[PDB]
């Protein structure tokens, strides 16, 4: 099946990404606090709902938080400022907070049920966000010999996410806060602050990257150049 591509809101970042974030893939964005990760997640949750000539997939969204990150009013702001109905955009986002890493795993199973339900409607799920994907795994699996079990559990969780991406033609978008540990995303994007309030993105280990860095801002429209 053809790969779909969701615009980030930034033409610079879209170009770096080859047109947008891909369905049938896990894209990981990582960086320090304040680097733009959560703002990119909120923007994507709006952009994916647009028609394709506006960079979207006419898609619904599922969002798993590990920390308290999701802000429905920020969604409303981004939508309103892009010419959309803010409250209609909220109706196409399903949100859950993971209590711990085991609950996080169950939530992915439940996500599959909604994905199946919507698959052959005109607003199938096209974006699954997992914010701070490793945060519970890092707090729970700690101490001597914890590395092996933590990374094994993570690998399984990531395999479950890859399966949903590939089986249902969804973009999976995950964030993490700052090797040598394993990583299993399709594409890894490093974000950092730049001058003038900008953010800078770089692809990590993607030799089929035409080399470069993207520059973008965080505004009332979410992410833009």
């Amino acid at each position: 099946a053809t790969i779909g591509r969701i615009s980030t809101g930034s033409k610079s970042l879209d170009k770096l990404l080859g047109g947008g974030i891909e369905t049938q893939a896990i894209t990981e964005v990582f960086g320090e606090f304040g680097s733009g990760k959560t703002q990119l997640a909120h923007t994507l949750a709006v952009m994916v709902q647009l028609p394709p000539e506006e960079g979207g997939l006419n898609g619904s969204v599922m969002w798993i938080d590990t920390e308290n990150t999701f802000r429905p009013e920020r969604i409303r702001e981004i939508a309103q400022n892009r010419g959309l109905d803010p409250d209609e955009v909220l109706k196409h986002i399903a949100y859950a907070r993971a209590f711990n890493s085991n609950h996080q795993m169950l939530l992915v199973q439940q996500a599959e049920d909604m994905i199946k339900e919507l698959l052959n409607t005109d607003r199938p799920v096209k974006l699954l966000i997992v914010d701070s994907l490793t945060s519970h795994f890092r707090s729970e699996y700690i101490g001597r010999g914890a590395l092996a079990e933590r990374q094994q559990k993570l690998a399984k969780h990531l395999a479950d996410l890859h399966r949903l991406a590939n089986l249902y033609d969804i973009a999976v978008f995950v964030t993490n806060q700052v090797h040598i540990l394993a990583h299993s995303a399709t594409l890894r994007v490093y974000l950092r602050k730049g001058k003038g309030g900008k953010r800078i993105a770089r692809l990590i280990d993607a030799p089929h990257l035409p080399e470069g860095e993207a520059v973008f801002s965080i505004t009332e429209k979410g992410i833009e150049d």
Binding site: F70, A94, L107
Partner: peptide, 15 residues
């Protein structure tokens, strides 16, 4: 809150 909810309902719940 133990499971998914639509974001419009979530906004209302948190208020």
């Amino acid at each position: 809150l133990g499971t998914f909810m639509r974001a419009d309902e979530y906004l209302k719940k948190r208020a």
